[PDB]
Amino acid sequence: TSQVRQNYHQDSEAAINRQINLELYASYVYLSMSYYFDRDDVALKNFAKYFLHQSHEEREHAEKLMKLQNQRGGRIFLQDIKKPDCDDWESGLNAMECALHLEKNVNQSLLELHKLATDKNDPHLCDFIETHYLNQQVKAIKELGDHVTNLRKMGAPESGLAEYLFDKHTLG
Amino acid sequence: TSQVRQNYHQDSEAAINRQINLELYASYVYLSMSYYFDRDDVALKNFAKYFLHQSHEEREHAEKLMKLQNQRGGRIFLQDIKKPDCDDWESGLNAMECALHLEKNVNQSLLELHKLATDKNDPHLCDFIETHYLNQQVKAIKELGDHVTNLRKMGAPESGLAEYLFDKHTLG
Amino acid sequence: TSQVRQNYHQDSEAAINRQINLELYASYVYLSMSYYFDRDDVALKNFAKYFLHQSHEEREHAEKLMKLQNQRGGRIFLQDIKKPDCDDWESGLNAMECALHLEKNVNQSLLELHKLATDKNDPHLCDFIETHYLNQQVKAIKELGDHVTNLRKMGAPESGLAEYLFDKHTLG
Amino acid sequence: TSQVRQNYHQDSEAAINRQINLELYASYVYLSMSYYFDRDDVALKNFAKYFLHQSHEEREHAEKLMKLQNQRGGRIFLQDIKKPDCDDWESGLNAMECALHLEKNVNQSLLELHKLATDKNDPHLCDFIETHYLNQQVKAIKELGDHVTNLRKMGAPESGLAEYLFDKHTLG
Ligand SMILES: [Mg+2]
Numbered sequence: 247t248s249q250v251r252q253n254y255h256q257d258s259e260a261a262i263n264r265q266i267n268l269e270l271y272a273s274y275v276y277l278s279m280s281y282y283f284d285r286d287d288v289a290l291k292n293f294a295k296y297f298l299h300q301s302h303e304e305r306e307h308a309e310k311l312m313k314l315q316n317q318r319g320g321r322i323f324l325q326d327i328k329k330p331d332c333d334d335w336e337s338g339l340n341a342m343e344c345a346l347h348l349e350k351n352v353n354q355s356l357l358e359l360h361k362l363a364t365d366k367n368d369p370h371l372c373d374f375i376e377t378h379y380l381n382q383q384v385k386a387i388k389e390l391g392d393h394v395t396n397l398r399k400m401g402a403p404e405s406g407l408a409e410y411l412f413d414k415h416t417l418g
Numbered sequence: 419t420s421q422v423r424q425n426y427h428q429d430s431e432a433a434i435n436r437q438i439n440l441e442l443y444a445s446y447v448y449l450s451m452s453y454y455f456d457r458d459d460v461a462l463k464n465f466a467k468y469f470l471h472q473s474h475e476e477r478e479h480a481e482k483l484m485k486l487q488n489q490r491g492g493r494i495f496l497q498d499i500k501k502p503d504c505d506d507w508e509s510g511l512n513a514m515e516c517a518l519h520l521e522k523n524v525n526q527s528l529l530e531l532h533k534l535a536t537d538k539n540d541p542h543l544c545d546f547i548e549t550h551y552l553n554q555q556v557k558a559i560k561e562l563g564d565h566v567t568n569l570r571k572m573g574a575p576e577s578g579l580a581e582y583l584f585d586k587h588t589l590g
Numbered sequence: 591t592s593q594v595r596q597n598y599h600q601d602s603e604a605a606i607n608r609q610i611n612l613e614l615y616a617s618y619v620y621l622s623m624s625y626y627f628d629r630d631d632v633a634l635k636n637f638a639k640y641f642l643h644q645s646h647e648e649r650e651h652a653e654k655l656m657k658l659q660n661q662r663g664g665r666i667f668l669q670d671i672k673k674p675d676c677d678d679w680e681s682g683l684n685a686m687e688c689a690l691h692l693e694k695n696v697n698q699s700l701l702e703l704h705k706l707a708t709d710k711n712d713p714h715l716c717d718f719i720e721t722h723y724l725n726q727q728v729k730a731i732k733e734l735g736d737h738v739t740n741l742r743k744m745g746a747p748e749s750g751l752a753e754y755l756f757d758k759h760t761l762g
Numbered sequence: 763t764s765q766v767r768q769n770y771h772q773d774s775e776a777a778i779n780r781q782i783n784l785e786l787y788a789s790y791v792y793l794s795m796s797y798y799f800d801r802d803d804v805a806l807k808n809f810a811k812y813f814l815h816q817s818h819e820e821r822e823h824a825e826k827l828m829k830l831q832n833q834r835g836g837r838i839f840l841q842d843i844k845k846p847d848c849d850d851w852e853s854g855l856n857a858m859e860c861a862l863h864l865e866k867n868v869n870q871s872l873l874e875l876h877k878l879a880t881d882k883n884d885p886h887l888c889d890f891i892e893t894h895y896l897n898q899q900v901k902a903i904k905e906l907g908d909h910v911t912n913l914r915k916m917g918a919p920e921s922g923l924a925e926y927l928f929d930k931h932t933l934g
Pocket residue numbers: 263264267268325
């Protein structure tokens with residue numbers, strides 16, 4: 247057993263490894279979305295920039311969990327990073343809707359992780375999740391909701407003009 | 419009687435208390451409007467910013483009247499601040515129309531206050547109203563009229579695109 | 591149901607609306623206290639400044655809760671802001687005692703809100719309350735306690751000199 | 763008749779000359795008060811500074827009225843500047859009370875002047891009085907009221923300590 251380990255349940259250790267994989271998966275989804283908008287037949291450069299930034303943020307989220315695993319004396323166990331659900335994302339609106347779904351799924355995982363940490367009476371882990379993950383998720387979900395609403399109200403996905411102008415005004 | 423009181427009719431004192439309440443009410447209306455546009459299903463951040471600024475301005479208007487009451491030796495009497503007429507404001511255009519109606523109502527109250535001050539031969543109070551309130555109201559009403567006109571001409575409220583673009587170009 | 595809503599109980603939503611009203615009420619109490627000390631027959635300008643600052647802080651507290659409501663996909667429901675308990679606050683000491691009572695009441699409401707959030711297993715809401723409200727309340731209560739103690743020890747409310755000197759040294 | 767004179771009643775011209783004398787008288791009262799506090803047996807240097815500043819302000823008030831008289835094509839008529847009512851002012855509190863009485867008397871004169879200007883349909887003169895005199899008077903009266911209140915509450919005039927500390931904290 248690690249010389250640093252204290253009050254860190256094996257179930258929590260395992261759950262943190264699962265969360266690391268999920269964050270990496272989220273980074274991969276956003277990477278794929280980014281380059282969809284870089285296609286010559288889609289060509290929305292600010293959608294591409296927005297999603298690439300999100301992808302880099304998720305990689306940071308994964309790294310912080312790997313750091314946490316080591317800080318607590320757990321051992322990192324990595325799994326394959328699954329390819330994203332979709333190859334073709336259809337429209338800016340559709341990609342934003344996929345992102346919203348993804349972030350709500352990640353949030354659910356984090357809430358399940360918090361429930362476990364609470365059940366195992368691990369207040370350090372609870373605080374870690376609360377401080378570095380929960381409000382970040384709420385902000386991300388709210389922002390994606392805002393984006394979806396604006397695209398819908400503007401006439402997306404039918405209106406190519408709507409997605410073009412959203413690209414310039416909101417994401418530019 | 420206050421050692422500072424001079425040429426300040428009890429009717430004017432009472433009217434100033436009523437105006438304080440009205441200014442606070444106006445601040446509350448604009449606060450409510452602001453956060454309507456912050457909803458994930460409305461999501462017009464510059465409408466939200468615009469109305470929040472207006473709300474803060476009305477609170478300043480109320481404070482200046484409270485200061486005036488004390489300067490003249492009257493006594494402040496506060497009443498409940500009523501909740502705004504509407505919870506749901508429908509659209510950017512509708513909120514602007516509500517604001518226009520509100521500011522015209524506040525203007526009418528100020529004109530009635532000025533008539534009273536004139537009738538009681540209180541030139542200090544007349545000058546106070548004229549200097550700090552009347553042109554501010556005329557400018558606010560004109561600006562809201564301008565906003566309503568632009569939103570209508572652009573195709574609001576039916577056009578979600580119109581409200582989106584107005585949010586960026588006029589309020590951004 | 592809001593596209594952003596996740597793990598946010600209707601009871602929590604309602605409690606947040608109640609808290610918004612309470613914060614606005616607290617802003618109103620402090621506004622009234624501020625202008626009491628601005629009266630020509632009270633004339634303690636630093637008491638007035640202190641309470642006006644507190645009033646503005648409470649308005650910020652209310653706005654942050656309105657922001658939270660929208661972030662979580664709840665819907666803001668506003669109620670009348672009740673006028674403060676007292677019109678005449680008697681002395682600096684009495685106003686400080688009223689403020690202490692108010693802040694302890696607001697704290698109790700926040701603790702009840704936290705209990706609800708805990709019961710509904712909402713760790714994001716728990717963290718929000720803990721981060722933005724609980725220590726702020728403890729600091730405010732401690733500061734008001736300190737102020738009350740000093741005024742008492744100095745000879746308030748009988749000693750007009752005590753309140754005058756406290757105004758200059760502690761609040762100035 | 764002056765080549766510049768227009769809509770300027772002879773009664774208004776005369777009233778402006780009377781006001782010039784009153785402003786000069788007020789400057790003289792404050793000059794006398796100032797040097798009372800400079801006496802070795804009174805020795806409150808900030809009371810002395812405060813009243814000397816007030817004296818200089820009144821001289822400016824008189825000059826602006828002399829300027830107005832010429833701007834409108836009236837002719838300045840000067841009278842003796844009467845010595846102040848009191849030679850000995852007793853205490854800081856008593857001097858502040860005398861100043862309050864003086865400023866209320868000057869205010870009454872200005873209100874009478876405004877009534878005359880209104881009766882003679884002279885909106886330029888009304889605006890001049892409103893802009894340069896009326897709120898200045900209200901502020902002065904309020905400030906003197908505040909000062910009187912503080913000195914009383916502190917224990918003046920019996921307490922030499924009260925007047926000493928007021929000199930340092932409020933006027934210093
Ligand atoms: Mg895994």
